[PDB]
Amino acid sequence: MENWSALELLPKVGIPTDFLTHVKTSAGEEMFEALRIYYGDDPERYNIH
Amino acid sequence: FEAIFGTFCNRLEWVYFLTSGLAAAAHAIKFHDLNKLTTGKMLFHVQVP
């Protein structure tokens, strides 16, 4: 595995998990469509800003 | 008498963009021409190791 892992530090800071299942389910289906249109459906590789 | 024993036509072969090998280098999409004011500004922030 890694030399040192940043993933250990995100929960301590307050940034939860990978955003994959989180922002989808925590959206209430209202933030989900906004994310799909104004942010992107695949945050890896690319994202719009 | 004088004889005619032939009338012939040229059988054309059709060419398509998507069935060509050159198309592999492309990412071809069909879209509306909604007058995008010379949209020559695609700005990218690309992560660098």
Curated annotation (Swiss-Prot), chain A:
Domain of life, per lineage: Viruses
Q: Which residues form a coiled coil?
A: none
Q: Where in the cell is it found?
A: Virion; Host nucleus
Family of the protein in this entry? Belongs to the herpesviridae major capsid protein family.
**Oligomer status and interactors:** Homomultimer. Makes the hexons and eleven out of twelve pentons. Interacts with triplex proteins 1/TRX1 and 2/TRX2; adjacent capsomers are linked together in groups of three by triplexes, heterotrimeric complexes composed of one molecule of TRX1 and two molecules of TRX2. Interacts with scaffold protein; this interaction allows efficient MCP transport to the host nucleus. Interacts with capsid vertex component 2/CVC2. Interacts with the small capsomere-interacting protein/SCP.
Q: What exactly does this protein do?
A: Self-assembles to form an icosahedral capsid with a T=16 symmetry, about 200 nm in diameter, and consisting of 150 hexons and 12 pentons (total of 162 capsomers). Hexons form the edges and faces of the capsid and are each composed of six MCP molecules. In contrast, one penton is found at each of the 12 vertices. Eleven of the pentons are MCP pentamers, while the last vertex is occupied by the portal complex.
The protein, known as: Major capsid protein
Q: Which residues of the full protein are shown?
A: 1 to 49 of 1370
